[PDB]
Amino acid sequence: QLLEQSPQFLSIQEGENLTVYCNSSSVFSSLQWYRQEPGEGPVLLVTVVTGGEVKKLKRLTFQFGDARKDSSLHITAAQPGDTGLYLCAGAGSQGNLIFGKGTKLSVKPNIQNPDPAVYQLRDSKSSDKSVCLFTDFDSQTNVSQSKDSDVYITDKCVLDMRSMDFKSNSAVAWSNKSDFACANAFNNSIIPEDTFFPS
Amino acid sequence: DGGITQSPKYLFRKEGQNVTLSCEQNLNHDAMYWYRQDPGQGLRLIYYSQIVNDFQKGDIAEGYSVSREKKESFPLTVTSAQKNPTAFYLCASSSRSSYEQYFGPGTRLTVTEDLKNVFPPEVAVFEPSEAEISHTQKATLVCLATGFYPDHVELSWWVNGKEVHSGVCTDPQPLKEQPALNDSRYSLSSRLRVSATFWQNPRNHFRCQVQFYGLSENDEWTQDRAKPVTQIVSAEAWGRA
Amino acid sequence: EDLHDKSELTDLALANAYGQYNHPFIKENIKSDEISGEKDLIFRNQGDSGNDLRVKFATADLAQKFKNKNVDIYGASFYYKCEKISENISECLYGGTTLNSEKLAQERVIGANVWVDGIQKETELIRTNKKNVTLQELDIKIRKILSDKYKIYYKDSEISKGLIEFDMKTPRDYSFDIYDLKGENDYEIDKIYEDNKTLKSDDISHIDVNLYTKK
Ligand code: NA
């Protein structure tokens, strides 16, 4: 008994629509969708119980196939908070649920006024020791990891400065490699040509 | 109305030591389920129980055992015989078997062969760049938690004695310092962004705090370095005008 | 006589029967002043989740009889092949329609004797506060009990044959072979109820259910 989900991974821009799909060769009396955040419990979104059922919960639209063999989840006007693992699950034959492997959704925030830059920050203590912060890039920029296992690079992270209505991306890189510098830290990435490298 | 819970959030054990996970439910459900979730394979069903005092094997039952004395609980025991016990453990219940399931919050279990592989986090706070300030009139601090194991940490920012959330992003995922090692140690970064003028006040105090979950009294240490027990590691910075 | 066997049904027909008898549409005190295609009554935004509800009847007469009345609905609802009326999603059922005013103070209780393989089991009970009740409502209520307790619409349960008989005080009795589905889809399965067959609730003596394993 098998439940296939596509796409397995989806990255899209805030504001776009998307459709995720769950299908089987098996018939199901019911089908559930869940949304899970990393290291947390999956949250039940819907149960559909009748072939051809359509259910709408705000921006989410769920549909059970006419032959009870598939379902889809359609999100309109995607928001960054929609980011998560979307799992479909079907009523199994032995008092169980049959789970798809999920669609891992990432919704990228619109950045209004990007100002990409790489800055150096120094330790409070050492210091001596430092990090490089690639920051203020728009969401068209991806941050790649290094093939050098002594160079550490985090993924991009969006912070939200509430009182200023201001969102920014950033990623941090660091290394003990002596010849590691802010100028070359983000060499694995395709960064904007007009990226500010100070002094 | 009611819910379903699990405890505790994190569990650490030496290889070969049996442990039991708790799952409790006052939803009036008959059926309860145990899953593990591993990055390549999503949710895999360990054991389940359609009704009180009845249980049966999931797809990966080897090395696990359960019991169902009571309607409201379904404890999962992980035995020495398991082999890859390290995983995220999820329990769920449904009104009746095969109906829609409601999940507990999950439990992280890490098991290692050698207690010597356990390290607390090293924490440092890096100060905002003068170039950033002048270019943007904003100021980003970065906190780095390095060389920890197990990957069971919780990071928080405190400004003037209270925890902030605005202008904070923490990596959803800790970074493996050696992707090839099995007992590889971990790192985690976080950012706190404030206006230039708020950073430029020497009255403002900034603290990054990492709650680490490591060894308990039960576990004994003879190694030369300090005992890596459950502990809070902090680093600090004051504003600069 | 020869009853139909569960093994004759496709997995779909079976899931569909499960779905129909577990999720009926139930609603009291609604009214339609709109006829679609001679036979159907339309209740806009009255269905589940604010869907449009189309109630299908066997004849113009039936549709006309309930046009503009305060009705109660209890019927098997489906989606596939439910003809839309507007742009909204349409939800369908056949029959299931009685007058809202015709009520009793307390629920009438109807006993349903059950046998499995000729062995008497626990007597079940179904209830209604309607002076006049559709046969469909009582049938759904019985089948819901049999689904819950005996798993009649689960493929791998041991029940293979079943007959529900309404032992009437009046001279005509009624019965349902639970595996004699008229097709595999909802719109086919539920069409047996399009006559809107309605009984005086006190005219029923009791219900006899006989189920059989194979084996
Ligand atoms: Na229905």
Residues C15 and C29 reside in one and the same domain: no
Q: Render C182-200 in DSSP notation, one character per residue.
A: SSSSHHHHGGGGTT--EEE
Q: Are C16 and C189 in contact (CB under 8 A)?
A: yes
Contact A119 B132 (CB under 8 A): yes
Q: Render B60-118 in DSSP notation, one character per residue.
A: S-TTEEE--SSTTB--EEE-TT-S---EEEEEEEESSTTS--EE---EEEEEES-GGG-
By three-state DSSP, how is residue C73 classified?
Answer: strand
Q: Where are the domains of chain B?
A: 1-113, 114-241
Contact B98 A133 (CB under 8 A): no
Residues A27 and A96 reside in one and the same domain: yes
Q: Are A6 and A105 in contact (CB under 8 A)?
A: no
Strand pairing class (A103-108; A9-13) = parallel
CA distance linking residue C73 with residue C25, whole number of Å: 7
Domain count, chain A: 2
Contact A119 B166 (CB under 8 A): no
Domain boundary among C100, C116, C151: C100
CA distance linking residue B26 with residue A89, whole number of Å: 23
Q: How does DSSP classify residue A1?
A: -
Q: Are C137 and C28 in contact (CB under 8 A)?
A: no
Tokens of A149: 């296992």
Strand pairing class (B175-176; B231-238) = unpaired
What are phi and psi for residue C8, nearest 5 degrees?
A: -70, -15
Q: CA nearest B47: which of B29, B37, B25, B62?
A: B62
With contacts defined as CB-CB under 8 Å, which chain A residues touch B178? 149
Handedness of CA B61, B12, B225, A180 (dihedral sign): positive
Contact A51 C49 (CB under 8 A): no
C199 CA distance to ligand 1 centroid (A)?
Answer: 22
Q: Are A48 and A71 in contact (CB under 8 A)?
A: yes
Q: Are C105 and C56 in contact (CB under 8 A)?
A: no
Q: How does DSSP classify residue A60?
A: E
Of all helices (H) and strands (E), which one includes residue C43?
strand C40-43
Is residue C129 less than 8 Å (CB to CB) from chain A?
A: no
By three-state DSSP, how is residue C139 classified?
Answer: helix
Q: Are B71 and B6 in contact (CB under 8 A)?
A: no
Q: Write the CB contacts of B29 (distance below 8 Å, at least 6 apart in sequence).
A: B4, B71, B93, B94, B95, B102
- Residue length, chain B? 241
Q: Write the CB contacts of B215 (distance below 8 Å, at least 6 apart in sequence).
A: B12, B115, B118, B221, B227, B228, B229, B230
Ligand-binding annotation for C33, yes or no, is: no
Q: Are B164 and B157 in contact (CB under 8 A)?
A: yes
By three-state DSSP, how is residue C17 classified?
Answer: helix
C-alpha triplet C65, C71, C75: angle, nearest 5°: 100
- The whole-angstrom distance between C132's CA and the closest CA on chain A is 29
Residues C96 and C144 reside in one and the same domain: no
Q: Are C80 and C39 in contact (CB under 8 A)?
A: no
Q: How far is CA C71 from CA A27, C38, C57, in A?
A: 35, 18, 14
Residues C86 and C114 reside in one and the same domain: no
C-beta neighbour count of B226 within 10 angstroms: 9
CA distance linking residue B226 with residue B216, whole number of Å: 13
Q: How does DSSP classify residue C3?
A: P
- Residue length, chain A? 199
Q: What is the CATH number of the domain that holds A100?
A: 2.60.40.10
Q: CA nearest A102: which of A176, A186, A4?
A: A4
Q: How far is CA C160 from CA A93, B125, C3, C183, C207, in A?
A: 17, 70, 10, 18, 20
- Convert B185-203 to b/e letters by CB count within 10 Å (16 or more is b): bbbbbbbbbbbeebbeeee
Residues A95 and A180 reside in one and the same domain: no
What are phi and psi for residue A94, nearest 5 degrees?
A: -115, 50
Residue from A45, A64, A99, A159 to probe the interface with B (highest B Cβ count within 10 Å): A159
By three-state DSSP, how is residue C163 classified?
Answer: strand
Residues A101 and A16 reside in one and the same domain: yes
Is residue B48 less than 8 Å (CB to CB) from chain A?
A: yes
CA distance linking residue A190 with residue B149, whole number of Å: 33
User: How many CA atoms lie within 13 Å of A23's alpha carbon, on the beta-carbon side?
Assistant: 9
Q: CA nearest C32: which of C85, C77, C83?
A: C85
Q: Could you name the CATH architecture of B1-113?
A: Sandwich (2.60)
Q: Are C155 and C147 in contact (CB under 8 A)?
A: no
Domain boundary among A81, A109, A137: A109
Is residue C77 less than 8 Å (CB to CB) from chain A?
A: yes
Contact A50 C49 (CB under 8 A): no
Residues C51 and C91 reside in one and the same domain: yes
Tokens of B106: 């999950």
Q: Are C211 and C5 in contact (CB under 8 A)?
A: no
What are phi and psi for residue C70, nearest 5 degrees?
A: -70, 100
Q: CA nearest A172: which of B169, C134, C155, B133?
A: B169
Residues A100 and A120 reside in one and the same domain: no
Domain boundary among C83, C100, C117: C100
By three-state DSSP, how is residue C201 classified?
Answer: helix
Portion 28-87 of A in contact with B at CB < 8 A: 29-30, 32, 34, 38-44, 47, 87
Q: B1-113 with B114-241: one CATH topology?
A: yes
By three-state DSSP, how is residue C22 classified?
Answer: helix
CA distance linking residue B96 with residue C153, whole number of Å: 15
Resolution (A): 2.1
Name which of B98, B142, B168 is nearest A92 (Cβ-Cβ).
B98
Residue from C9, C11, C91 to probe the interface with A (highest A Cβ count within 10 Å): C11
With contacts defined as CB-CB under 8 Å, which chain A residues touch B47? none
What are phi and psi for residue A83, nearest 5 degrees?
A: -55, 130
What is the separation, in whole angstroms, between the first and last Cα of chain B? Answer: 53
A71 CA distance to ligand 1 centroid (A)?
Answer: 17
Exposed, middle or buried, B176 (CB in 10 Å: 0-12/13-18/19+)?
middle
E strands of chain A, at which residues? 4-6, 9-13, 18-23, 31-36, 43-48, 54-57, 60-64, 70-75, 84-91, 97-99, 103-108, 117-122, 130-135, 152-153, 157-161, 166-174
Residues C4 and C53 reside in one and the same domain: no
Of all helices (H) and strands (E), which one includes residue C137?
helix C135-150
Can the peptide bond before residue C203 be classed as cis, meaning omega within 30 degrees of 0?
no
Identify the chains in contact with B, defined as 3+ C-beta pairs within 8 A: A
Q: What is the CATH number of the domain that holds C38?
A: 2.40.50.110
Residues C131 and C208 reside in one and the same domain: yes
Q: Are B88 and B106 in contact (CB under 8 A)?
A: yes
CA distance linking residue A146 with residue A199, whole number of Å: 25
Is residue B218 less than 8 Å (CB to CB) from chain A?
A: no
CA distance linking residue B93 with residue B70, whole number of Å: 13
Domain count, chain C: 2
Q: Are A10 and A20 in contact (CB under 8 A)?
A: yes
- Residue length, chain C? 215
Contact C77 A50 (CB under 8 A): yes
Residues A138 and A58 reside in one and the same domain: no
Q: CA nearest A152: which of B39, B145, B172?
A: B145
B114-241: what CATH class? mainly beta
Q: Render B150-208 in DSSP notation, one character per residue.
A: SS-EEEEEEETTEEE-TTEEE-SSPEES-TT-SS--EEEEEEEEEEHHHHT-TT-EEEE
CA distance linking residue C7 with residue B221, whole number of Å: 65
Contact A47 B100 (CB under 8 A): yes
By three-state DSSP, how is residue C48 classified?
Answer: helix
Q: How far is CA A67 from CA A26, A50, A157, B191, C12, in A?
A: 10, 10, 42, 50, 7
Q: Write the CB contacts of C123 (distance below 8 Å, at least 6 apart in sequence).
A: C111, C112, C113, C114
With contacts defined as CB-CB under 8 Å, which chain A residues touch C190? none
Q: Are C12 and A68 in contact (CB under 8 A)?
A: yes
Query: What range defines the domain where residue A64 resides?
Result: 1-109
Contact A55 C11 (CB under 8 A): no
CA distance linking residue C191 with residue C178, whole number of Å: 14
Q: The tokens 């009046």 sit on which residue?
A: C170
Q: Search chain C and give the residue with CA nearest A67.
A: C12
Ligand-binding annotation for C206, yes or no, is: yes
CA distance linking residue A44 with residue B224, whole number of Å: 49
C29 CA distance to ligand 1 centroid (A)?
Answer: 19
- For residue A27, the cross-strand partners are none
CA distance linking residue B184 with residue B88, whole number of Å: 18
Residue from C53, C79, C158 to probe the interface with A (highest A Cβ count within 10 Å): C79
Ligand-binding annotation for C203, yes or no, is: no
Q: How far is CA C139 from CA B18, B135, C13, in A?
A: 53, 76, 18
Query: What range defines the domain where residue C202 resides?
Result: 1-22+102-213
Of all helices (H) and strands (E), which one includes residue C120?
strand C119-120
CA distance linking residue A170 with residue A143, whole number of Å: 9
- Convert A68-83 to b/e letters by CB count within 10 Å (16 or more is b): bbbbbbbbeebeeebb
CA distance linking residue C61 with residue A104, whole number of Å: 55
C-beta neighbour count of A67 within 10 angstroms: 17
CA distance linking residue A168 with residue A191, whole number of Å: 15
- The whole-angstrom distance between C198's CA and the closest CA on chain A is 26
C-alpha triplet C28, C31, C36: angle, nearest 5°: 125
Q: Are C212 and C116 in contact (CB under 8 A)?
A: yes
Q: Are A55 and A68 in contact (CB under 8 A)?
A: no
- The whole-angstrom distance between B162's CA and the closest CA on chain A is 17
Q: What is the CATH number of the domain that holds C144?
A: 3.10.20.120
Domain boundary among A109, A131, A148: A109
Residues C83 and C142 reside in one and the same domain: no
Residues C96 and C193 reside in one and the same domain: no
**In A151-199, which ranges are continuous DSSP H helix?**
182-185
- For residue C154, the cross-strand partners are none
With contacts defined as CB-CB under 8 Å, which chain A residues touch B108? 39
B57 CA distance to ligand 1 centroid (A)?
Answer: 33
